[model samples]
Target: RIEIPVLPLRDVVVYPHMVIPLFVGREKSIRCLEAAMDHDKKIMLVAQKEASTDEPGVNDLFTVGTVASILQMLKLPDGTVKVLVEGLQRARISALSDNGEHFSAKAEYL
Candidate 1:
């Protein structure tokens, strides 16, 4: 399985070959995005089963997701970030681990 950082989305599903713009408000989520940006600019985006939850763990997300590359990032005045991501491929999460600052997972490209 391929290991990469993950971004948990609410009520959203990103598909391969698609380009989407997302607004990230949560501190940890923004940090995750920043981490990806500094590194490989690659992250897996997964949808949460429950959209209302403020904090979602790995178990709360769907297994199927998109492995995407960050296309653009803009810091907002509200301390949030606006990011453009391009889906590269489909992925299936095998395991997730909390890295203190963010969530990282082992996934296989499908």
Candidate 2:
């Protein structure tokens, strides 16, 4: 794995076996997604808490998340993209990667 750092999104709670579509536009995140695609099209998706401050950093990550695989991707003309991702399994990240770009750790099935 290329070790892509994932941003735990706000208001998006993903569960194992579930499918979700996300719209991407941020440059750093575009870089993150591109990295994931190059590796294996896999990423960890987590939902931020309702009390999160909406800041771009590790402090906003929640405790619950899932390992997801990209099922489909579509680029839009407005410099954004729509990606269809499917949750293969659920896991709780016990450790984070060196950078805050992708999520990595030893997680167990919930």
Best by lDDT: 1
Query: 1-110 in candidate 2: lDDT tens per residue?
Result: 22344656676677778888888776656666666688789877777656766454565676557778888877788878788889887666666553554445445556
Clashing pairs in 2: 4-102, 5-101, 5-102, 6-101, 6-102, 6-103
Off by over 4 Å in 1: none
Residue by residue across 1-110, what tens digits does model 1's lDDT show? 77788899875688998999998988999889988888889999988885548687667878889999999999998898999999999999887877779888899999
**Considering only N, C-alpha and C atoms within 3 Å, which residue pairs clash in candidate 1?**
none
Scored against the true structure, residue 39 in model 2 reaches a CA lDDT of 74
RMSDs, each prediction? 1.5, 2.9
